[PDB]
Amino acid sequence: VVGGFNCEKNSQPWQVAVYYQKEHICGGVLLDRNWVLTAAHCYVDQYEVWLGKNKLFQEEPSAQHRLVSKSFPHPGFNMSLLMLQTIPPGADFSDDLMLLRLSKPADITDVVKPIALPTKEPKPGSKCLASGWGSITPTWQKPDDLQCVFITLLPNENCAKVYLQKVTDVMLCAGEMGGGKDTCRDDSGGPLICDGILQGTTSYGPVPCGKPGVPAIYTNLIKFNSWIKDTMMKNA
Amino acid sequence: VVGGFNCEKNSQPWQVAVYYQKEHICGGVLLDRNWVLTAAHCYVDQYEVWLGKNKLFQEEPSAQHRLVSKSFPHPGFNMSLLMLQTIPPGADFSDDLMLLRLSKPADITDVVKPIALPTKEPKPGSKCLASGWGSITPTWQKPDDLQCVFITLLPNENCAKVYLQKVTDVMLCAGEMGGGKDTCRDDSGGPLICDGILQGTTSYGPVPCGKPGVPAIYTNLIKFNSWIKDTMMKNA
Amino acid sequence: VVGGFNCEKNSQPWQVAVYYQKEHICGGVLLDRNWVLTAAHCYVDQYEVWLGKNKLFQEEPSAQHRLVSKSFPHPGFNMSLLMLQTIPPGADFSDDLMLLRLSKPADITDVVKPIALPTKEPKPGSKCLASGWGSITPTWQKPDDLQCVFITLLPNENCAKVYLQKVTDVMLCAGEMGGGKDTCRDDSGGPLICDGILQGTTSYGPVPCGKPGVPAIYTNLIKFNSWIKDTMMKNA
Amino acid sequence: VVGGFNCEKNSQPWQVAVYYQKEHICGGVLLDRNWVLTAAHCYVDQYEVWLGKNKLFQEEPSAQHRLVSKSFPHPGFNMSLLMLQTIPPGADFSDDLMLLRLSKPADITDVVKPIALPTKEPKPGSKCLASGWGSITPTWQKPDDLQCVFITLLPNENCAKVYLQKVTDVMLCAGEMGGGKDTCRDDSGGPLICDGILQGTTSYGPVPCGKPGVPAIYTNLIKFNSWIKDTMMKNA
Ligand SMILES: *[C@@H]1O[C@H](CO)[C@@H](O[C@@H]2O[C@H](CO)[C@@H](O)[C@H](O)[C@H]2NC(C)=O)[C@H](O)[C@H]1NC(C)=O
Ligand SMILES: *[C@@H]1O[C@H](CO)[C@@H](O[C@@H]2O[C@H](CO)[C@@H](O)[C@H](O)[C@H]2NC(C)=O)[C@H](O)[C@H]1NC(C)=O
Ligand SMILES: *[C@@H]1O[C@H](CO)[C@@H](O[C@@H]2O[C@H](CO)[C@@H](O)[C@H](O)[C@H]2NC(C)=O)[C@H](O)[C@H]1NC(C)=O
Ligand SMILES: *[C@@H]1O[C@H](CO)[C@@H](O[C@@H]2O[C@H](CO)[C@@H](O)[C@H](O)[C@H]2NC(C)=O)[C@H](O)[C@H]1NC(C)=O
């Protein structure tokens, strides 16, 4: 994240680190012992996840490593957009969710704890926290320590005004109009918590990150509650 | 390109500047009045070309603007790799080639002329030229003037040693082992002229560009002649 | 140093060029007629200094050559780290300081003068200067003329975020987040002048030097005053 | 190694890859199911080894990973020299050997096979093979594929003439007077096989590697046969 700070040790127990083998690629959110939530755009052949991490590059004994048995990308995400080198005006990136079923259940401890799905609808003006090991430079340099930033939930209008892509109902708009604070490359899939509640996850934003006047796009989690639950329950 | 020089004025009438909306994204080679060659990885929905261009930020009346009717990416290029967030070890980027059918044929002036495909196979040691408006810095910054650079054709083992991806017969290894001279981001699709002869196209290379002991990959055009001719002859 | 400029002639009479045989290896600071300060990691068996030097490849008569009688590395610097082939994560490089007793005292001319230790503690935001004949390229190449550069004193969290090693109270974080300006290899031991005041010495930084978002470490001299004075007063 | 070539797949079954956690640091030689041989100068806190590797950065299913239970550096190697930033003239680097006892025996297969200690004394003029994943650039860039080079065994006189360090009886001298072919950074501990027999291991060489007229120093294995065997037998 850009313009953030070092989250407190173990303050974000639900924060996940998604890997493609030995390489960190995204952020995630732990929802249940066998279920992690991330962005549908973190597309790779095999997945591995790290729970309880604070230092991305140092091995902490209280962390937990796990393999992923299967991934369930939302059926609404247009995968075809990924092959494109440039985003076509009017492109719709709605439904940027994906569920990952861990092969071996995770051990809920002091260090690892899931977070509950939201029940209320996001209210603009709200103070939200974003977290991750995404780049700390607007254009790329990852940090060791997990980063945290505070941002404001803004009306979708704000985002739709400045983007060429479609800003839909299943999206959220948040950031700092003054720029300088924003999520960035590889923060994807990470959690967005407002007034202490999980409201959505990091999806896409401006190039460069923190561009003044251009907020970032997050998934509106409330709109997906059914699909998630349905998938969890239907899949052993 | 990195470590090159401003190509002399109008020296390369075959250099194509492939745009998308108002911005340049790739390079290419003029092979006919209504046929342009480029990299399969320069994937976008709509295509536009500029010919007889020298400056990237200047109206040139000698210059010809056009549009592309149909694009034909080589049936071998694994497009799936493009959606992946990270390149897995062993990923084969062979056949990185794509033809672009023009809407309205190009007028052959002294500033806009084609180049023939080779019949002579390449031999290491040879001196080659590459050009484009790719970054002039190793990591980015596009130049106003078209850049040119001289590099040495190396045997494939030089590239294979350092690349985790597969280096094949349909590929060429070129650059300067000492580093400092190479093609960079957005030079893709441009031409590789070895001994006044077109031997291949800019596929990909290391990042940073011009990394010592890490040359770059180019398509071994000679292996695509049959295909190239058929696609023009059979179709449009 | 990277991205600096040739220090004006004789502007830094305190800059010391620490040699070993015929070659320069480190920098240092003149604190007295018979006392030079440098980095504990500039470990060799015999020590030689040159003072009032501007060029590295030129006999300067204003310049004074000497020899070191006894060297006293700070009792805190873990010398063991120096034998290790790779730095383990968490390695603490605190107390990187070493005093050098001269054989024959230095004559104080207008070209060879000491500098006082600070009493004022440093505050972020400050503008600091660093100099030396370290590499002028990010990865090496020593300059003839002494280099100078201006950088900003940053809070320690900026360094800690990106360093796998421990960043402590006895350390300072300085550089330019944008990259391009920094100290490089063989600048170690040289001085850090913040607001016309000596605040610390070049300890270590990233490789490449001047890496964006990765500033460099310097010793927080203020924390070593008691020790520094005792070692001169008690001994030689 | 510099100026070498890609060893044939699995041609050097005794070749070892020594790691400090996830980082490759040296080469080694497999002597027995529980014993690996490397340089005493590969100094780190914990050791791990990879057997049957051909690609250093790609995971091969026929490779073998193992942990090291204890290291036995030759009691004659002067460890104190490691803390030195510059080598003092006349420094003696004799006895650069170290034994590593694997925690779990290795499985001798087609891919992994130990090599026997030498019985005859090295004869000058001999054609020798050196191998490793050390730098491929004289000053650093490691390869994926294991590299092999052919060099000549030369009289010690040749080496003693050009080095400032002591060249002793327990050392060997080898290289190409024409320069260009030599071992390099991180080839350390690797095997040196002459006329099909293990004669010694890589120790130190010129900076840069392959410097014309400056051969490289390897350990004269025959002189250490007793100590090795004694250590193997005496240590469970
Ligand atoms: C084209 O690229 C894709 C992406 O790497 C390859 O697809 C993978 O293939 C393996 C088996 O070979 C599967 O286990 C993975 O799950 C596949 N991933 C996806 C996203 O489908 C594909 O094999 C490549 N094709 C070729 C000919 O190399
Ligand atoms: C997914 O994204 C692609 C690319 O924007 C869409 O494909 C385009 O669809 C329109 C018609 O709706 C065509 O005219 C374009 O030429 C198509 N472009 C390409 C590259 O195929 C696609 O429609 C989007 N949505 C879905 C549901 O597929
Ligand atoms: C190991 O290397 C060190 C450094 O060369 C040797 O220590 C030197 O020993 C001489 C006397 O033989 C002293 O005059 C030097 O001042 C010492 N230098 C240092 C830095 O201690 C040491 O003797 C070498 N050999 C052994 C067996 O220790
Ligand atoms: C000084 O540095 C050395 C090298 O890393 C440290 O020594 C290691 O200490 C651990 C236990 O803390 C042992 O398990 C390792 O085997 C030690 N390695 C060696 C080579 O002795 C030492 O702890 C450091 N000292 C401090 C105070 O940090």
CSV table of N, CA, C and O and ligand atoms in Angstrom, one decimal, chain C residues 43-46, chain D residues 76-82 84 88-92, ligand 3:
chain,number,residue,atom,x,y,z
C,43,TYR,N,37.4,-3.2,8.1
C,43,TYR,CA,38.4,-4.0,8.7
C,43,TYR,C,39.5,-4.6,7.8
C,43,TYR,O,39.2,-5.3,6.9
C,44,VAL,N,40.7,-4.2,8.1
C,44,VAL,CA,41.9,-4.6,7.5
C,44,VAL,C,43.0,-4.7,8.5
C,44,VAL,O,42.7,-4.3,9.7
C,45,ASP,N,44.2,-5.2,8.2
C,45,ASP,CA,45.2,-5.3,9.2
C,45,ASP,C,46.0,-4.0,9.5
C,45,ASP,O,46.2,-3.6,10.6
C,46,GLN,N,46.4,-3.4,8.4
C,46,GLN,CA,47.2,-2.1,8.5
C,46,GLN,C,46.3,-1.0,8.0
C,46,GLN,O,45.5,-1.2,7.0
D,76,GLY,N,42.8,-26.4,10.3
D,76,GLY,CA,43.9,-25.6,9.8
D,76,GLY,C,43.5,-24.3,9.1
D,76,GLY,O,44.4,-23.5,8.9
D,77,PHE,N,42.3,-24.2,8.6
D,77,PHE,CA,41.8,-23.0,7.9
D,77,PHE,C,41.8,-21.8,8.9
D,77,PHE,O,41.2,-21.9,10.0
D,78,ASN,N,42.5,-20.7,8.5
D,78,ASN,CA,42.5,-19.5,9.4
D,78,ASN,C,41.2,-18.8,9.2
D,78,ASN,O,41.0,-18.0,8.3
D,79,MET,N,40.2,-19.0,10.1
D,79,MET,CA,38.9,-18.3,10.0
D,79,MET,C,39.0,-16.8,10.1
D,79,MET,O,38.2,-16.1,9.5
D,80,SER,N,40.0,-16.3,10.9
D,80,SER,CA,40.2,-14.9,11.1
D,80,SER,C,40.3,-14.1,9.8
D,80,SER,O,40.0,-12.9,9.8
D,81,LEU,N,40.8,-14.7,8.8
D,81,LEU,CA,40.9,-14.0,7.5
D,81,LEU,C,39.6,-13.6,6.9
D,81,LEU,O,39.6,-12.6,6.2
D,82,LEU,N,38.5,-14.2,7.3
D,82,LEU,CA,37.2,-13.9,6.8
D,82,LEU,C,36.7,-12.5,7.2
D,82,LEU,O,36.0,-11.9,6.4
D,84,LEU,N,38.4,-9.9,7.4
D,84,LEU,CA,39.1,-8.9,6.7
D,84,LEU,C,38.5,-8.5,5.4
D,84,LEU,O,38.2,-9.3,4.5
D,88,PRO,N,45.5,-9.4,3.2
D,88,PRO,CA,46.9,-8.9,3.5
D,88,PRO,C,47.9,-9.7,2.7
D,88,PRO,O,47.8,-11.0,2.6
D,89,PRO,N,48.9,-9.0,2.2
D,89,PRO,CA,49.9,-9.7,1.4
D,89,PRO,C,50.5,-10.9,2.2
D,89,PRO,O,50.8,-10.7,3.4
D,90,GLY,N,50.7,-12.0,1.6
D,90,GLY,CA,51.3,-13.2,2.3
D,90,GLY,C,50.2,-14.0,3.0
D,90,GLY,O,50.6,-14.9,3.7
D,91,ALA,N,48.9,-13.6,2.9
D,91,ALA,CA,47.9,-14.4,3.6
D,91,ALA,C,47.9,-15.8,3.1
D,91,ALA,O,48.0,-16.1,1.9
D,92,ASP,N,47.7,-16.8,4.0
D,92,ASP,CA,47.7,-18.2,3.8
D,92,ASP,C,46.3,-18.7,3.9
D,92,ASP,O,45.7,-18.8,4.9
E,3,LIG,C1,45.4,-15.6,10.5
E,3,LIG,O1,45.2,-14.4,9.8
E,3,LIG,C2,45.5,-13.2,10.7
E,3,LIG,C3,45.5,-12.0,9.8
E,3,LIG,O2,46.5,-12.1,8.8
E,3,LIG,C4,46.9,-13.4,11.4
E,3,LIG,O3,47.0,-12.3,12.4
E,3,LIG,C5,48.1,-11.5,12.3
E,3,LIG,O4,49.2,-12.2,12.9
E,3,LIG,C6,50.4,-11.4,12.9
E,3,LIG,C7,51.5,-12.2,13.6
E,3,LIG,O5,51.7,-13.4,12.9
E,3,LIG,C8,50.2,-10.0,13.6
E,3,LIG,O6,51.3,-9.2,13.5
E,3,LIG,C9,49.0,-9.3,12.8
E,3,LIG,O7,48.8,-8.0,13.3
E,3,LIG,C10,47.8,-10.2,13.0
E,3,LIG,N1,46.7,-9.5,12.3
E,3,LIG,C11,45.5,-9.6,12.9
E,3,LIG,C12,44.3,-8.8,12.2
E,3,LIG,O8,45.3,-10.2,14.0
E,3,LIG,C13,47.1,-14.7,12.0
E,3,LIG,O9,48.4,-14.9,12.6
E,3,LIG,C14,46.8,-15.8,10.9
E,3,LIG,N2,47.2,-17.1,11.3
E,3,LIG,C15,46.8,-17.6,12.5
E,3,LIG,C16,47.3,-19.0,12.8
E,3,LIG,O10,46.0,-17.0,13.2
